[PDB]
Ligand binder design. Structure first.
Ligand SMILES: *[C@@H]1O[C@H](CO)[C@@H](O[C@@H]2O[C@H](CO)[C@@H](O[C@@H]3O[C@H](CO)[C@@H](O)[C@H](O)[C@H]3NC(C)=O)[C@H](O)[C@H]2NC(C)=O)[C@H](O)[C@H]1NC(C)=O
Ligand SMILES: *[C@@H]1O[C@H](CO)[C@@H](O[C@@H]2O[C@H](CO)[C@@H](O[C@@H]3O[C@H](CO)[C@@H](O)[C@H](O)[C@H]3NC(C)=O)[C@H](O)[C@H]2NC(C)=O)[C@H](O)[C@H]1NC(C)=O
Ligand SMILES: *[C@@H]1O[C@H](CO)[C@@H](O[C@@H]2O[C@H](CO)[C@@H](O[C@@H]3O[C@H](CO)[C@@H](O)[C@H](O)[C@H]3NC(C)=O)[C@H](O)[C@H]2NC(C)=O)[C@H](O)[C@H]1NC(C)=O
Ligand SMILES: *[C@@H]1O[C@H](CO)[C@@H](O[C@@H]2O[C@H](CO)[C@@H](O)[C@H](O)[C@H]2NC(C)=O)[C@H](O)[C@H]1NC(C)=O
Ligand SMILES: *[C@@H]1O[C@H](CO)[C@@H](O[C@@H]2O[C@H](CO)[C@@H](O)[C@H](O)[C@H]2NC(C)=O)[C@H](O)[C@H]1NC(C)=O
Ligand SMILES: *[C@@H]1O[C@H](CO)[C@@H](O[C@@H]2O[C@H](CO)[C@@H](O)[C@H](O)[C@H]2NC(C)=O)[C@H](O)[C@H]1NC(C)=O
Ligand SMILES: *[C@@H]1O[C@H](CO)[C@@H](O[C@@H]2O[C@H](CO)[C@@H](O)[C@H](O)[C@H]2NC(C)=O)[C@H](O)[C@H]1NC(C)=O
Ligand SMILES: *[C@@H]1O[C@H](CO)[C@@H](O[C@@H]2O[C@H](CO)[C@@H](O)[C@H](O)[C@H]2NC(C)=O)[C@H](O)[C@H]1NC(C)=O
Ligand SMILES: *[C@@H]1O[C@H](CO)[C@@H](O[C@@H]2O[C@H](CO)[C@@H](O)[C@H](O)[C@H]2NC(C)=O)[C@H](O)[C@H]1NC(C)=O
Ligand SMILES: *[C@@H]1O[C@H](CO)[C@@H](O)[C@H](O)[C@H]1NC(C)=O
Ligand SMILES: *[C@@H]1O[C@H](CO)[C@@H](O)[C@H](O)[C@H]1NC(C)=O
Ligand SMILES: [Zn+2]
Length: 902
């Protein structure tokens, strides 16, 4: 029998009731340069089963408690056993209190400790964050408990189902502000031992999970709003950011998003206030701490002067995502990390709904298709994928827990939940959702609890009928990896399903309890008219007249790609769809105009259609005004550009794209009144951004003229940038491409004085668009200079240069030559060799290039590859795949482009 302190899961013998936690960050180092925090805690817990050991989590804490590492008392008149000894077991991250007798069922105990830890700049637990305000380096104290780091700040039963109330006190410099989950109890009071410090106590939290705790000590300031129901809403940021008004957009959307969710969830916002805080360089991006949500600055702040529309979209959706969790995830919590997909998947879906409420003219809900569905299908159409569900007993270590946070959990989770809501109808979905939240409020669940409540809503009505239970359907989508391609023969109306893999030669070795068969909801449109809904049962082949067509008719499946699958047709139906798109595109919903392109290119990759059929699906684009179908083409063709931009294929390709985009460019020229005013809504603005990008990068003279004119105008009046933030990346890039050192030196000067990260990013990237070899090489020479290029931006800048067809050999030589910088950057800055390697070798598609990559690997003697070890293996395998693809596709693609480039 293994000792419990050697098991990764806590015993169930003791359950926490409530905690007092007092934390005191020391924001001045101890002269050795060490920053620390001190703390004191008392946990009150209940004995469920007799035990003579207390096992609680503790990570990187030193104990200074008088006596043993803890003091143990009984609550009320309970007697307590004497402590035998306390020890720390580092591997399983435990503090272990061995007792001389047993705790008694039904009795409550209080365990007190005093401790300290490093306030490291490690983004884990209670940690420090350094940033600049003018000449002064500022340091604040903040938290990131997700997933298993609460125990790094104080000893606790650090599993999500072991919920408790928390009384947080911060002891901090008297001129700084202290924030936590709950409002402060009142005004701060001086610390008696040293009145330079103050003591801020916070109101008791609701019953909640340790991973959602937060506390922050900083100089930050806020913009505020009180909602009609009295809920205080604040956006916190650096005093300069607040003064510039960069917190305003977030403040604008927050109230409406909270209102949307209270109604959507049929549940009041469960806290007295909402704080959201913008942290400089918060690498986790965003964390849904209950009542105190943390964001990286560029995720929460918005500058109308320099920020593009895509920046606005990022802000409203990231906010909606975190706010979604304040009910789903925080109020009702998944019992264990193996079900992380339900929590993050749900938030990743409803972020679009919440954002749509704040910005109802934007059609934001559409963006889940490009943003999540087709994104995750790329990795879920591999033999190396994995099911959404993982047995709980396989998820034990903090590393195993962290592995839950991936593209499948977030984006496939979002995709399958959106499919579920769609086939149930939103009204029915919302009813089950409300029932689930009301039943499990302040408690924990598994995904089976949601299915059961959804089933209850299904069973309480008669309109929506399903081919099986909610659970049996969802099991097909959650217990096995991947997704089917649905193939229709419109001559007969025969319809089939099979596990879709991009590599037709791939061997799947992960077994499925269902033999990779799904129960598939199938909406369809025929001649532009919605048909009756259909369910494909767990069969390989079926037939229905819904999918049988006449010679002059067409059918199209999966309206708005609500279903998590791709669709193939017989060539005749494809041709009819193409005809419809050529003659009157308005008849096919915009999302399906994108689907036709997305799916066919994937099908070509899989050898289920010829590559020419996929290309034929781009032919209609010359008349397409809307964002998504163009985006689908551009995403699908980026690999073609990557493979062929140094070959004889490139000329006809550019010419074809010039032909396709010219009318869209012309359209926006008129609509925008000679480019003076942006289109109204988000999607049209996105379309303009892509149109100008496509036009300019493919050498459309009218676009080249625009870019030169705007940049020249800017150079003649630097303080007044005439280029709208939406277009800056293209205009900057094309203009630097056309020009020489005058444009380059001007943009470099602008970069060096850039106050805002998003503008600096645009400049760094555009500078890589120079067509002068000497300018690119001189630029490369700058990438390793911290005075000129931030370390964190080094590999990104090299990759941008590599992306330039001219910079490709320059960057590859630069990387090979300077690879002797691994023992300079691995302990001091992680650097990410993996990204660099992938970026620089991205183009490789010849045996000769493979031979070069093998030769570079032949420095195996010491130096190594660091964190990019076996990312080099991925590059070698990718090159082999590229060689095979180019050989198979070169002639066919060349001839298609020549044929269709006029
Ligand atoms: C977790 O923290 C809580 C907040 O500090 C503690 O509750 C507080 O306990 C204090 C006593 O330890 C009380 O303060 C005063 O104590 C003096 C003792 O001499 C009494 O005269 C007073 O009655 C009392 N002051 C007032 C204004 O009543 C606090 O009253 C009390 N605060 C509360 C209940 O909100 C918890 O004790 C602590 N938990 C554990 C297990 O230690
Ligand atoms: C938690 O306790 C740890 C173990 O006691 C502390 O880590 C130790 O810090 C010591 C002092 O800072 C280091 O020992 C030596 O200290 C002398 C005098 O300060 C120096 O001359 C030496 O350079 C130093 N030794 C070395 C090899 O550098 C220990 O290195 C170190 N022990 C470890 C890490 O196992 C923590 O500081 C303490 N943390 C907090 C937040 O209180
Ligand atoms: C947070 O919400 C605010 C209220 O809805 C928005 O405030 C609006 O800002 C607009 C842009 O600054 C203003 O529109 C126009 O501004 C120009 C330039 O100064 C003026 O010429 C126009 O008179 C003005 N109105 C027009 C063209 O109709 C709005 O006036 C203003 N609305 C209100 C009620 O004050 C904020 O924009 C918003 N913050 C962010 C970052 O989006
Ligand atoms: C955290 O603070 C709360 C609020 O003061 C404490 O809740 C009280 O707990 C005591 C002892 O169990 C009860 O007599 C009171 O009825 C509670 N008050 C309320 C409003 O719930 C809680 O005990 C504190 N936590 C700890 C660990 O001391
Ligand atoms: C809070 O008080 C501290 C200590 O007086 C201030 O920190 C100093 O700030 C000045 C800049 O004006 C620096 O020159 C010093 O080096 C800082 N001293 C220390 C010990 O850090 C701080 O500026 C005050 N902050 C606010 C918001 O009032
Ligand atoms: C949650 O939903 C319920 C049920 O729809 C809401 O109660 C209804 O409110 C409307 C509004 O006038 C009434 O017409 C219905 O008669 C109510 N139905 C019932 C059964 O009470 C309720 O207001 C919602 N609650 C929250 C907190 O959002
Ligand atoms: C995890 O969640 C379950 C609910 O899904 C909790 O069990 C419930 O506890 C409440 C409140 O004490 C009872 O009213 C219910 O009867 C329980 N339902 C059950 C057992 O199905 C459970 O307590 C939570 N786990 C922890 C450690 O708090
Ligand atoms: C469409 O499905 C039908 C029926 O499932 C297929 O017809 C069957 O084909 C096999 C081939 O040997 C015959 O043995 C059966 O007798 C046929 N069943 C009939 C006619 O009812 C048909 O081949 C399919 N058509 C396709 C895939 O184009
Ligand atoms: C397919 O998606 C489109 C959006 O791309 C849906 O059209 C929207 O529908 C709602 C409700 O009918 C309207 O409020 C919006 O104004 C519509 N927007 C546009 C641009 O048309 C359409 O309803 C979806 N089709 C199906 C069958 O669900
Ligand atoms: C897959 O299995 C087949 C034999 O069934 C074999 O020919 C092939 O080499 C295997 N691997 C790949 C990557 O195709
Ligand atoms: C094309 O179809 C749209 C949408 O169904 C319709 O409104 C329009 O009349 C049609 N236009 C033409 C030119 O056929
Ligand atoms: Zn989330």
């Amino acid at each position: 029998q293994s000792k419990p302190w050697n098991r990764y899961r806590l015993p169930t013998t003791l359950l926490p009731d409530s905690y007092n936690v007092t934390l005191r960050p020391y924001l001045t180092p101890n002269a050795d340069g060490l920053y620390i925090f001190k703390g004191k805690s008392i946990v009150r817990f209940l004995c469920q089963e007799p035990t003579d050991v207390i096992i609680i989590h503790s990570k990187k804490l030193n104990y200074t408690t008088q006596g043993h590492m803890v003091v143990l008392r009984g609550v009320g008149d309970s007697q307590v056993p004497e402590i035998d000894r306390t020890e720390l077991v580092e591997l399983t991250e435990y503090l272990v209190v061995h007792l001389k007798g047993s705790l008694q069922p039904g009795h409550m105990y209080e365990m007190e400790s005093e401790f300290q830890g490093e306030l490291a700049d490690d983004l884990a637990g209670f940690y420090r964050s350094e940033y600049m305000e003018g000449n002064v380096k500022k340091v604040l104290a903040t938290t990131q408990m997700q997933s298993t780091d609460a125990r790094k700040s104080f000893p606790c039963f650090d599993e999500p189902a072991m919920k408790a109330t928390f009384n947080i006190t911060l002891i901090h410099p008297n001129n700084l502000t202290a924030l936590s989950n709950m409002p402060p109890k009142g005004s701060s009071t001086p610390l008696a031992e040293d009145p330079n410090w103050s003591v801020t106590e916070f109101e008791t939290t609701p019953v909640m999970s340790t991973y959602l705790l937060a506390y922050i000590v900083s100089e930050f300031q806020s913009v505020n709003e009180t909602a009609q129901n009295g809920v205080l809403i604040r956006i916190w940021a650096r005093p300069n950011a607040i003064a510039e008004g960069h917190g305003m957009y977030a403040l604008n959307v927050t109230g409406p998003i909270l209102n949307f969710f209270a109604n959507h969830y049929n549940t009041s916002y469960p806290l007295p206030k909402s704080d959201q805080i913008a942290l400089p360089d918060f690498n986790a991006g965003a964390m849904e701490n209950w009542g105190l949500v943390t964001y990286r600055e560029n995720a929460l702040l918005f500058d109308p002067q320099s920020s593009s529309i895509s920046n606005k979209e990022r802000v409203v959706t990231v906010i909606a995502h975190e706010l979604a969790h304040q009910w789903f995830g925080n109020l009702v919590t998944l019992a264990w990390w193996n079900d992380l997909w339900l929590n993050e998947g749900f938030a990743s879906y409803v972020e679009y709904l919440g954002a749509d409420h704040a910005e109802p003219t934007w059609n934001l809900k559409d963006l889940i298709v490009p943003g999540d569905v087709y994104r995750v299908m790329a990795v879920d159409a591999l033999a190396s994928s994995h099911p959404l569900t993982t047995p709980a007993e396989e998820v034990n270590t903090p590393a195993q827990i962290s592995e839950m946070f991936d593209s499948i959990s977030y984006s496939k989770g979002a995709s399958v939940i959106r499919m579920l809501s769609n086939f149930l109808t939103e009204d029915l979905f919302k009813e089950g959702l409300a029932s689930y939240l009301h039943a499990f409020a302040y408690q924990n669940t598994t995904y089976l609890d949601l299915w059961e409540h959804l089933q209850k809503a299904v069973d309480a009505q008669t309109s929506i009928r399903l081919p099986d239970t909610v659970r049996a359907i969802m099991d097909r989508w959650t217990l096995q990896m991947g997704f089917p391609v649905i193939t229709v023969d419109t001559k007969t109306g025969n319809i089939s399903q099979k596990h879709f893999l991009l590599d037709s030669e791939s061997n799947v070795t992960r077994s499925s309890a269902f033999d990779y068969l799904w129960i598939v909801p199938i909406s369809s449109i025929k001649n532009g008219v919605m048909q009756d809904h259909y369910w494909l049962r767990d069969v390989s082949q079926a037939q229905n007249d819904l999918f049988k067509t006449a010679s002059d008719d067409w059918v199209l499946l999966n309206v708005n790609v609500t279903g998590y699958f791709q669709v193939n047709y017989d060539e005749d139906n494809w041709r009819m769809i193409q005809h419809q798109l050529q003659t009157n595109l308005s008849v096919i919903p915009v999302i399906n105009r994108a689907q036709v392109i997305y799916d066919s290119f994937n099908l070509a990759t899989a050898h289920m259609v010829p590559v020419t059929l996929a290309l034929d699906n781009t032919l209609f684009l010359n008349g397409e005004k809307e964002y998504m179908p163009w985006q689908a083409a551009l995403s699908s063709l980026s690999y073609f550009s990557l493979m062929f931009d140094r070959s004889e294929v490139y000329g006809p390709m550019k010419k074809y794209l010039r032909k396709q985009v010219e009318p869209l460019f012309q359209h926006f020229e008129t609509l925008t009144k000679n480019w003076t005013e942006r289109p109204e809504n988000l999607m049209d603005q996105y379309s303009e951004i892509n149109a100008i990008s496509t036009a300019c990068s493919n050498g459309l003279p009218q676009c080249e003229n625009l870019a030169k004119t705007l940049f020249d105008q800017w150079m003649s009046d630097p303080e007044n940038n005439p280029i709208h933030p939406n277009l800056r990346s293209t205009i900057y890039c094309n203009a630097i491409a056309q020009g020489g050192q005058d444009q380059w030196d001007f943009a470099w000067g602008q970069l060096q004085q850039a106050q805002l990260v998003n503008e600096a990013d645009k400049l760094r990237s555009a500078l890589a668009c120079s067509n002068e070899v000497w300018l690119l090489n001189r630029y490369l020479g700058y990438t390793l200079n911290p005075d000129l290029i931030r370390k964190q931006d080094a590999t990104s800048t090299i990759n941008s240069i590599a992306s330039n067809v001219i910079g490709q050999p320059l960057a590859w030589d630069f990387v090979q030559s300077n690879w002797k910088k691994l023992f300079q950057d691995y302990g001091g800055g992680s650097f990410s060799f993996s990204n660099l390697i992938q970026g620089v070798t991205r183009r490789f598609s010849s045996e000769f290039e493979l031979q070069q990559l093998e030769q570079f690997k032949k420095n195996n003697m010491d130096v190594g590859f660091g964190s990019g070890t076996r990312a080099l293996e991925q590059a070698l395998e990718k090159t082999k795949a590229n060689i095979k693809w180019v050989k198979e596709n070169k002639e066919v693609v060349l001839n298609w482009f020549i044929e269709h480039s006029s």
